[PDB]
Design a protein around this ligand. Structure first.
Ligand SMILES: [K+]
Ligand SMILES: [K+]
Ligand SMILES: [Mg+2]
Ligand SMILES: [Mg+2]
Ligand SMILES: [Mg+2]
Ligand SMILES: [Mg+2]
Ligand SMILES: [Mg+2]
Ligand SMILES: [Mg+2]
Ligand SMILES: [Mg+2]
Ligand SMILES: [Mg+2]
Ligand SMILES: [Mg+2]
Ligand SMILES: [Zn+2]
Lengths: 217, 25, 129, 97, 81, 150, 87, 96, 121, 206
RNA sequence: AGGGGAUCGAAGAUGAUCAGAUACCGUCGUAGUCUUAACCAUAAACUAUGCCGACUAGGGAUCGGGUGGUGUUUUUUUAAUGACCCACUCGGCACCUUACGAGAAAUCAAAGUCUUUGGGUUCUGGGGGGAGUAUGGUCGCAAGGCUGAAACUUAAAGGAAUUG
RNA sequence: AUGUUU
């Protein structure tokens, strides 16, 4: 089974929290991948690459394997994990776990008018990792994801269908390009818009609403 | 070779070239 | 030396907002500065601003409300035609639904939306979003 | 890269500092860069303070000190262990021991 | 901080500030009425007087210039106009 | 700041916000104008006239009491100099440095400072010729600099 | 953000900092929500009834959340003379 | 600023600076100097006929081996002598 | 030397964590209890464990030791109260029933409280 | 919104003044503390005990808002506050961290550590920087006993108090526990002096 | 080109090491080192960080100036400057911590306020060599300085950092 | 004090 720790996870397994949007609204730190698994059952994972990293020690070649994974549902949610382990398989599994933990929401929007079911981003956005700067620009319908294959895969797993991309820096560094694209994705719900200007009543945390979930009877 | 000594050798070469061009006319 | 008091004012406002301050003092507080601030305040990116009359060029204290992502000048003040207003908005604004390219036109200082609905153009002054 | 935040010397606001000569090898070093140590040794340490005080014709002589400011170049100071190689973070520490 | 009344700074901070860095710049100098050893006027002397001012109708030195505020000849009364 | 230096000094007068005479000031505008004309006839430049007025009298600003600047008062009363005071003092400093230079000839620092002073002279003279304070052919020459400051 | 015919098509309308009005993101683990209990009829601290303030990780990292909470509390009550506008 | 003039009347300086700095580009400098015509035995042309003069085996550069069976050719167009590789397994026997 | 390794020290701490209402501070009646409540596979290691447990429980009577909680630290803490009781809460005493404060503290109290016994020098 | 019963009384006012809570740090004081009453000579700054009391009451209301008392963690690595937090977590249902904090106690959900509180209170932000940093890693609000030279980073409620004195530290913790109990209901009437005297929280070296 | 030339000392001479040692080391020693009158115009001429302007953290020292204090010490006769102490302030050489922020990083209060890209302005660079070479021009007594290619060649060269 | 090369 699960046997949860992380009273947030306890609430998720108890069914008090039923949408990950609540976790996102209260910025609740998730520590078990099972929370993400039960709140987003339709979450597919794509391994982007495995590369050997090498440490020199006394004839050297410690040759650990590092795997980049993107998990996501093509509706609002992606996460990105990067994990190094002794074997490709275990690195992939731990990376899937890390990506699920890192799952964040994306804010989709419209390029032009308000015709239903947002297809693009709400604003221009930029993410940076190392020397790699990835910029996402809202695109009209039918534009598709204009990005290099890895970033395009991350974006369709995010659920974006129309976006323009621009890049600078050593984009052949796949890890930095994916991390920059992930930062750009995440910043969409950090960019304050006039339609978000309106002040909300600051709801109460689920951890407080159901406080009888930290005990051992 | 050191850049300083490369420059010195090149200057000596330049001096010799100037001298040869001077002797010629 | 000072070449753009509007640039100095907008830079001070940007720095105060990105450091989280709710108020910013700007000097020397010219007429173009006041008009630009009036546009920003009409669209609600700043709060109230008060002009302090020293018998020099003056000062302004602006109240920021946390809704400003960036205000900036476009220097030089490029001549902008009606059809180039769209290129400027595309280049400067984060989206097509909000933000403003602010121009100086002979119909007055104004954002690009009321510029294009008065069918006037001029020189580009700055932007706010 | 740049190994030391200011430089391996102490000169900011100066431009040129007149040199000094290393006491050990005579290498010219800018005065601010030279490693300077003061020596206030007793004129007679020599295992023989008691012997000199006995041989002295003066009671309570209060034998003097020899004063000497030594200026070492970097090479000579390192070689003679007046100064030692320190870790990257220990270098950023200017207090004496 | 992050919230302060820039339009109404406290008198203490305003007096601490440099004369050009107050909310509105203004001088911290003043004018004094120094009692002449004679009569017919109380001589007006700038606080930061650069001149060795003498009485209008006499030749006694009222102040000696300094780097900042002037001196007062070590016998004089001085109202702070 | 410091057109010919790396100095960033801000020290200057901070004139008051009040554009009217101080309440404790009772002298007439005619009386201060008369004192100004008297000092000008005694040969003082507007700067030292203002210094004397503020130090020995209570006239904080001749422009706030008489409603006119001291140089404008002197010009209206016919006591203006043939060249402005700042230009005159710049040329006097240039003459002094040039005399020291023709007596020393190894003071390269003085040569450099004289170049700076003459650059300032030429910039100020160009301004004055632009605003027609000086004749359009007014010229500063090293050998006649004394000839035009005396 | 709604679509045509005005139905909310955006998930998770985010919270905004009570001090600086910036958006509290999902990964801002330095941000903090403070509940101050309400007092009725000489104490007893009614459970579930608070005054709620959201402070952004930026403010807390700048070390200004204390002053900002002083201001916001005192504006809501909860503090009479701690924070002054003039300084 | 950014080390370049921004003034509205700075177009002459901007374009002159671009003109000066375009000379640091390989392609621009080659095209404007006309290297292909003076240098480049093919006078800026795709192909050139020539007369073989000698068969030659040049030993491939390290770390390789297997001398490469080229031919010295004298171009009909201008007269220069160029070494041309003969690409295939064999295919030297078809050139005399 | 006579330093005990981790497989001695940690096992002793684990024994004392759950068997404090158990084997006393005597080694002979310590090793015997170890024999029946611990699967020690060698008498020498058993002797080591029992000796270190004897030492731990002998020094337990001189103050609590780090990393050891047998659900008695809380009890003894709540038991040991008021080392200086029923004398002075530092209230209305230790003076002429006043507070020996400075002038600025005096103005501090004058800001709101009209009733404070003060001896402001 | 708090009644004159919650106003500062002469009894606990002179209790603070006797414990020397108002004796702030020297001329060196963090320029984020407007809790400073006029600076006396010898450099020592006087802490406004009115503001100290108001902040203590606000912190007590924040603690009382917490539904489960065990989800409130009192932390002190300094000896002068360890007995204070132990007695505080005895009187209130809080969870004490006295002595070492074991970095990784808020992340790293491994046993012997990893409480997951809703609020953290620290005796000294400087000496408990690690706990404050971890709280900033996991969204935990922080109350801190702050001297005028204490760092304010990731400290949401600063109770201005001298922390160089064991008397001051113990008394502040004692008043915090008192107000928490009063707000809860343990102390039915906020007029009695809470018979347990403010020495059970002080340090005892011998 | 005059003067001066103690010292040290390119060259040079010698002693010793060494396989060689026309190097390091030792002893001398010319030019030079110093100065006057003229040239030369180059340095890792470095902070390898153009200049002007504005803004964005905290802190304590320190230099110069100024202001204030129930201040300490110092005497002239009230008072006084002077030195010092405390607080503030302007300007400067810097420094410490933290970085919202920046950066490839080292690190950086500027190298920040840059893909949310525009305050003004000058100069410079465009893979590594060939090469600061050839040539022409110009300056210089000369040494050289400034300007400055091409043919040809090459898949790296290079920066910061990590573990060995 | 000297100790080259791969
Ligand atoms: K091969
Ligand atoms: K000589
Ligand atoms: Mg190195
Ligand atoms: Mg130099
Ligand atoms: Mg200035
Ligand atoms: Mg200039
Ligand atoms: Mg050079
Ligand atoms: Mg250089
Ligand atoms: Mg190149
Ligand atoms: Mg390297
Ligand atoms: Mg080899
Ligand atoms: Zn040496």
């Amino acid at each position: 089974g699960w046997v949860p720790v992380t009273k947030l996870g306890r609430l998720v397994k108890a069914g008090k929290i039923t949408t990950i949007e609540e976790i996102f609204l209260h910025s609740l730190p998730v520590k078990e991948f099972q929370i993400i698994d039960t709140l987003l059952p339709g979450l597919q994972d794509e391994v982007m690459n495995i590369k050997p990293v090498q440490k020199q020690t006394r004839a050297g070649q410690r040759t650990r394997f590092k795997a980049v994974v993107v998990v996501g549902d093509s509706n609002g949610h992606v996460g990105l994990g990067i994990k190094t382990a002794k074997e490709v398989a275990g690195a992939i599994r731990a990376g899937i776990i890390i990506a699920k933990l890192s799952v964040i929401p994306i804010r989709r929007g419209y390029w032009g008018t308000n015709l239903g079911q947002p297809h693009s981003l709400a604003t221009k956005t930029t993410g940076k990792c190392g020397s790699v700067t990835v910029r996402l620009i809202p695109a009209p319908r039918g534009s598709g994801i204009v990005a290099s294959p890895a970033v395009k895969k991350l974006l369709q797993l995010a659920g974006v269908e129309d976006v323009y991309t621009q890049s600078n820096g050593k984009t052949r560094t796949l890890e930095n390009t994916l991390k920059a694209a992930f930062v750009a994705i995440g910043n969409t719900y950090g960019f304050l818009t006039p339609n978000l200007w309106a002040e909300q009543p600051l709801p109460v945390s689920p951890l407080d609403i159901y406080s009888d979930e930290a005990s051992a009877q | 070779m050191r850049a300083k000594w490369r420059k010195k050798r090149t200057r000596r070469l330049k001096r010799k070239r100037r001298k040869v061009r001077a002797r010629s006319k | 030396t000072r070449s753009s008091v509007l640039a100095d004012a907008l830079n001070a406002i940007n720095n105060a907002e990105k450091t989280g301050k709710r108020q910013v003092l700007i000097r020397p507080s010219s007429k173009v500065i006041i008009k630009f601030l009036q546009v920003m305040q009409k669209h609600g990116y700043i709060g109230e601003f008060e002009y302090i009359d020293d018998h020099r060029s003056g000062k302004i204290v602006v109240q920021l409300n946390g809704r400003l992502n960036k205000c900036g000048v476009i220097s030089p003040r490029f001549n902008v035609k009606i059809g180039d207003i769209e290129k400027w908005t595309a280049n400067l604004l984060p989206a097509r639904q909000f933000g403003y390219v602010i121009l100086t036109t002979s119909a007055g200082i104004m954002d690009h939306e009321e510029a294009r609905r008065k069918h006037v153009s001029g020189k580009i002054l700055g932007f706010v979003y | 890269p740049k190994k030391r935040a200011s430089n391996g010397r102490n000169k900011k606001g100066r431009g040129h500092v007149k040199p000094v000569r290393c006491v050990n090898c005579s290498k010219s070093i800018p005065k601010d860069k030279a490693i300077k140590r003061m020596a206030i040794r007793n004129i007679v340490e020599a295992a023989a303070v008691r012997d000199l005080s006995e041989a002295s014709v003066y009671p309570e002589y209060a034998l003097p000190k020899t004063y000497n400011k030594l200026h070492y170049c970097v090479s000579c100071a390192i070689h003679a262990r007046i100064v030692r190689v320190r870790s990257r973070e220990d270098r950023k520490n200017r207090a004496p021991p | 901080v992050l919230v302060q009344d820039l339009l109404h700074p406290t008198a203490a901070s305003e007096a601490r500030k440099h004369k050009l860095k107050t909310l509105v710049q203004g001088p911290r100098s003043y004018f004094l009425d120094v009692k002449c050893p004679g009569c017919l006027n109380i001589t007006t002397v700038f606080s930061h007087a650069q001149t060795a001012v003498t009485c209008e109708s006499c030749s006694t030195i009222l102040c000696t210039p300094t780097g900042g505020k002037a001196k007062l000849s070590e016998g004089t009364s001085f109202r702070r106009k | 700041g410091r057109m010919h230096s790396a100095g960033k000094g801000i020290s200057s007068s901070a004139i008051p916000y009040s554009r009217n005479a101080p309440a404790w000031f009772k002298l007439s505008s005619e009386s201060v104008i008369e004192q100004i004309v008297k000092y000008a006839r005694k040969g003082l430049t507007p700067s030292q006239i203002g210094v004397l007025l503020r130090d020995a009298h209570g006239v904080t600003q001749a422009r706030v009491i008489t409603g006119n600047k001291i140089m404008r008062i002197l010009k209206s009363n016919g006591l203006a100099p043939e060249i402005p005071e700042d230009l005159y003092y710049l040329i006097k400093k240039a003459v002094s440095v040039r005399k020291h230079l023709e007596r020393n000839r190894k003071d390269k620092d003085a040569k450099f400072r004289l170049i700076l002073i003459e650059s300032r002279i030429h910039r100020l003279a160009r301004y004055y010729r632009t605003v027609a304070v000086l004749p359009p052919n007014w010229k500063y020459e090293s050998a006649t600099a004394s000839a035009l400051v005396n | 953000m709604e679509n045509d015919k005005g139905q909310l098509v955006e998930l998770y309308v985010p919270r905004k900092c009570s001090a600086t009005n910036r958006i509290i993101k999902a990964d801002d683990h330095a941000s903090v929500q403070i509940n101050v209990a309400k007092v009725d009829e000489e104490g007893r601290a009614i459970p579930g009834e608070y005054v709620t303030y959201a402070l952004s990780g930026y403010v807390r990292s700048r070390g200004e959340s204390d002053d900002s909470l002083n201001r916001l509390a005192q504006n809501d009550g909860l503090l009479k003379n701690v924070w002054s506008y003039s300084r | 600023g950014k080390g370049k003039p921004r003034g509205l009347n700075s177009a002459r300086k901007l374009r002159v600076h671009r003109r000066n700095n375009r000379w640091a580009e390989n392609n621009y400098k080659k095209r404007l100097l006309g290297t292909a015509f003076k240098s480049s035995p093919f006078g800026g042309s795709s192909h050139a006929k020539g007369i073989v003069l000698e068969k030659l085996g040049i030993e491939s550069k390290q770390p390789n081996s297997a001398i490469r069976k080229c031919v010295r050719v004298q171009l009909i167009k201008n007269g220069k002598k160029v070494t041309a590789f003969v690409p295939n397994d064999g295919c030297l026997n078809f050139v005399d | 030397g006579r330093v005990r390794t981790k497989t001695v020290k940690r096992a002793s701490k684990a024994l004392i964590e759950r068997y404090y209402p158990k084997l006393t501070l005597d080694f002979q009646t310590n090793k015997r209890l170890c024999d029946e409540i611990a699967t020690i596979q060698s008498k020498r290691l058993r002797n080591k464990i029992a000796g270190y447990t004897t030492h731990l429980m002998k020094r337990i009577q001189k103050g609590p030791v780090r990393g050891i909680s047998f659900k008695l630290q809380e009890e003894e803490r709540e038991r040991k109260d008021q080392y200086v009781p029923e004398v002075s809460a530092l209230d209305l005493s230790r003076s002429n029933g006043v507070l020996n404060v400075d002038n600025q503290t005096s103005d501090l109290v004058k800001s709101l409280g009209l009733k404070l016994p003060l001896s402001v020098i | 919104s708090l009644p004159a019963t919650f106003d500062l009384t002469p009894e606990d006012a002179q209790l603070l003044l006797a414990a020397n809570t108002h004796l702030g740090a020297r001329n060196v004081q963090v320029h984020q503390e407007p809790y400073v009453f006029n600076a006396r000579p010898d450099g020592v700054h006087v802490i406004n005990v009115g503001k100290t009391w108001e902040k203590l009451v606000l912190a007590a209301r924040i603690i009382a808002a917490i539904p489960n008392p065990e989800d409130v963690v009192a932390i002190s690595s300094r000896t002068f506050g360890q007995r204070a937090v132990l007695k505080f977590a005895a009187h209130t249902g809080a969870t004490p961290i006295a002595g070492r904090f074991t970095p990784g106690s808020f992340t790293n959900y491994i046993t012997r550590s990893f409480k997951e509180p809703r609020l953290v209170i620290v005796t000294d932000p400087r000496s408990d920087a690690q706990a404050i940093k971890e709280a900033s890693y996991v969204n935990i609000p922080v109350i801190a006993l702050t001297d005028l030279d204490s760092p304010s980073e990731f400290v949401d409620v600063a109770i201005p108090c001298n922390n160089r004195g064991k008397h001051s530290i113990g008394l502040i913790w004692y008043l915090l526990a008192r107000e928490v109990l009063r707000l809860r209901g343990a102390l039915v009437d906020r007029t009695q002096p809470w018979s347990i005297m403010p020495d059970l929280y002080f340090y005892r070296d011998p």
